[PDB]
Amino acid sequence: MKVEVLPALTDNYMYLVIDDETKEAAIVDPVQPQKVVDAARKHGVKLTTVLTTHHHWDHAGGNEKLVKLESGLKVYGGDDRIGALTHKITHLSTLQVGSLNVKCLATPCHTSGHICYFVSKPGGSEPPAVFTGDTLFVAGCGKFYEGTADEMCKALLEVLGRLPPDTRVYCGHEYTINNLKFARHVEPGNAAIREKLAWAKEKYSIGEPTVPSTLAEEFTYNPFMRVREKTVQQHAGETDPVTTMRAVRREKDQFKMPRD
Amino acid sequence: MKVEVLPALTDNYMYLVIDDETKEAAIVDPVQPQKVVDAARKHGVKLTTVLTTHHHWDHAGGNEKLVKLESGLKVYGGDDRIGALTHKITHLSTLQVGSLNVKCLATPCHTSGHICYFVSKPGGSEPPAVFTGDTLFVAGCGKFYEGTADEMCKALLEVLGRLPPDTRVYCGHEYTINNLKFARHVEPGNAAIREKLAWAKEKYSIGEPTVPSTLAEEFTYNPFMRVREKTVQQHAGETDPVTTMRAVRREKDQFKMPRD
Numbered sequence: 001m002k003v004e005v006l007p008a009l010t011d012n013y014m015y016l017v018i019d020d021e022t023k024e025a026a027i028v029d030p031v032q033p034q035k036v037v038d039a040a041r042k043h044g045v046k047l048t049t050v051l052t053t054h055h056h057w058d059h060a061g062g063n064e065k066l067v068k069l070e071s072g073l074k075v076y077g078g079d080d081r082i083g084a085l086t087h088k089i090t091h092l093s094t095l096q097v098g099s100l101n102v103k104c105l106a107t108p109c110h111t112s113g114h115i116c117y118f119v120s121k122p123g124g125s126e127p128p129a130v131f132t133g134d135t136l137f138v139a140g141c142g143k144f145y146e147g148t149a150d151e152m153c154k155a156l157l158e159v160l161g162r163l164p165p166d167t168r169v170y171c172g173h174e175y176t177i178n179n180l181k182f183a184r185h186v187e188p189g190n191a192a193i194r195e196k197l198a199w200a201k202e203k204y205s206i207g208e209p210t211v212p213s214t215l216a217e218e219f220t221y222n223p224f225m226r227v228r229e230k231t232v233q234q235h236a237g238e239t240d241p242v243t244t245m246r247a248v249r250r251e252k253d254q255f256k257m258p259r260d
Numbered sequence: 261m262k263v264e265v266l267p268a269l270t271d272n273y274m275y276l277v278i279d280d281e282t283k284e285a286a287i288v289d290p291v292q293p294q295k296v297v298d299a300a301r302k303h304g305v306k307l308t309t310v311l312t313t314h315h316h317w318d319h320a321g322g323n324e325k326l327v328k329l330e331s332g333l334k335v336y337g338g339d340d341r342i343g344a345l346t347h348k349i350t351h352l353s354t355l356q357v358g359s360l361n362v363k364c365l366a367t368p369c370h371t372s373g374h375i376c377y378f379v380s381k382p383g384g385s386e387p388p389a390v391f392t393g394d395t396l397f398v399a400g401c402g403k404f405y406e407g408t409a410d411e412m413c414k415a416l417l418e419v420l421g422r423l424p425p426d427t428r429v430y431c432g433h434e435y436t437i438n439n440l441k442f443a444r445h446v447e448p449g450n451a452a453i454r455e456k457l458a459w460a461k462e463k464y465s466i467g468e469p470t471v472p473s474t475l476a477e478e479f480t481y482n483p484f485m486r487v488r489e490k491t492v493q494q495h496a497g498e499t500d501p502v503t504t505m506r507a508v509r510r511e512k513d514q515f516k517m518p519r520d
């Protein structure tokens with residue numbers, strides 16, 4: 001399995017997911033379709049499938065155009081608002097991309113039809129990957145546009161959180177530096193936050209993406225994944241994960257980003 | 261002048277303003293009209309005038325009923341949505357209650373037609389009074405239902421804030437304890453806030469209202485009157501009074517009130 005990161009717009013990421021065995025490929029959130037076709041031609045792969053994390057235009061807005069550029073595509077998604085949808089899927093729906101297995105995970109909160117895609121190789125030895133859209137970012141999470149704090153706790157701690165620790169996390173946006181500046185405010189004594197922030201500023205300087213991260217890493221530095229940690233609860237002034245999540249998300253929504 | 265504080269509903273205040281010379285009186289926000297009639301009869305005065313701060317039902321909901329209990333009343337207000345008006349007034353309109361002088365002050369924000377009434381006795385032998393409805397509370401301010409942060413800054417800092425410092429403040433609700441708990445979160449080092457908080461808890465225990473306060477006192481402990489102070493700006497992460505007002509009011513809107 002190979003994953004190519006394709007920057008789009010100002011700070012979005014699309015992902016070309018290649019099956020090494022058949023050379024069949026999938027594209028996650030193809031908002032700039034000519035870049036998708038250029039990348040598939042560069043790697044000599046056959047695009048067969050579109051995996052759409054949610055209906056927001058910055059993720060699904062290129063679907064109509066892509067199905068006119070390329071024929072025979074199967075467009076997957078969990079919401080009727082998604083453009084050019086052909087296969088409506090739900091929690092635990094499965095499909096194949098060549099030899100790769102894909103499992104759809106419903107993570108409603110940022111939008112009510114959000115789906116994360118868990119991709120693996122049955123019987124293989126390589127680590128799996130999870131395409132998290134605007135549910136889980138590197139050191140952050142999506143704004144709660146169509147959902148509650150309880151729903152984000154379920155998505156992060158029970159659905160994504162119970163996946164293998166070595167799972168590679170490939171999110172919707174390049175928000176890593178600002179997410180870690182907020183994390184550093186929540187937990188001033190956490191060294192993993194500080195070292196990941198120095199690493200992210202170096203990657204931004206050389207023009208390289210900050211994805212993927214891993215689920216084990218998210219549990220060390222992401223305040224929203226750490227709502228069961230006493231430091232985060234004490235910062236929020238709460239004693240359970242749901243009220244803590246609600247408080248930390250409201251605080252980040254109003255936070256002024258420092259310039260360093 | 262004599263001001264009789266009359267509790268109404270759950271936490272509203274109505275105010276009987278008596279001219280001791282002529283025995284004539286005005287009533288501010290007469291939501292429970294029979295209580296108003298008994299008080300006037302108890303004090304041996306003739307009700308002549310209604311001063312309405314704004315149209316919300318908890319302030320103006322008794323106006324039409326009151327004019328059916330007592331004939332010949334002059335009912336003042338700055339909004340056509342107020343029931344039973346006889347005299348529509350605006351910024352700097354003047355009138356008399358017996359020998360007392362009344363000046364209307366337009367303070368649009370909580371509602372577009374909100375008016376505060378500044379009452380003074382010719383001479384200077386007693387401190388004046390201002391009836392502020394839901395614009396200025398003891399240690400707080402009204403929600404911005406029909407206005408902006410800039411309008412609340414003008415209402416508090418220029419219109420009300422330029423009145424004599426000894427002016428007594430008679431506001432629409434008994435919100436003082438909760439207002440001071442929020443103020444303590446904004447400025448945890450401010451001694452006037454914690455001292456007023458402890459005093460307000462004692463007044464609540466013995467059943468005495470926390471009104472009137474004075475304009476001088478509000479400048480020491482009200483976070484909305486203190487948007488020009490460096491401590492309040494630092495809490496909000498802002499460097500000017502308008503953006504600070506907007507941030508502090510948004511924060512109070514979703515603030516979880518502590519138990520002590």
Ligand SMILES: N[C@@H](CCC(=O)N[C@@H](CS[C@H](O)N(O)c1ccc(Br)cc1)C(=O)NCC(=O)O)C(=O)O
Pocket residue numbers: 056057058134140141142143145173175252
């Ligand atoms: N353009 C915005 C970007 C900032 C923003 O709010 N980003 C979203 C993901 S994108 C997004 O959600 N979106 O573009 C969108 C598109 C269509 C609709 Br309808 C609603 C939203 C988010 O969840 N951020 C995480 C955080 O702040 O911690 C701004 O005004 O700064």
Ligand SMILES: N[C@@H](CCC(=O)N[C@@H](CS)C(=O)NCC(=O)O)C(=O)O
Pocket residue numbers: 318394400401402403433512
């Ligand atoms: N959640 C509030 C709602 C009450 C409310 O909206 N009160 C109006 C006055 S009728 C207001 O402007 N309150 C000022 C504030 O919330 O600071 C409570 O019960 O304390």
Ligand SMILES: [Zn+2]
Pocket residue numbers: 054056110134
């Ligand atoms: Zn989105």
Ligand SMILES: [Zn+2]
Pocket residue numbers: 056058059134172173
């Ligand atoms: Zn997005």
Ligand SMILES: [Zn+2]
Pocket residue numbers: 314316370394
């Ligand atoms: Zn009101």
Ligand SMILES: [Zn+2]
Pocket residue numbers: 316318319394432433
């Ligand atoms: Zn009110």
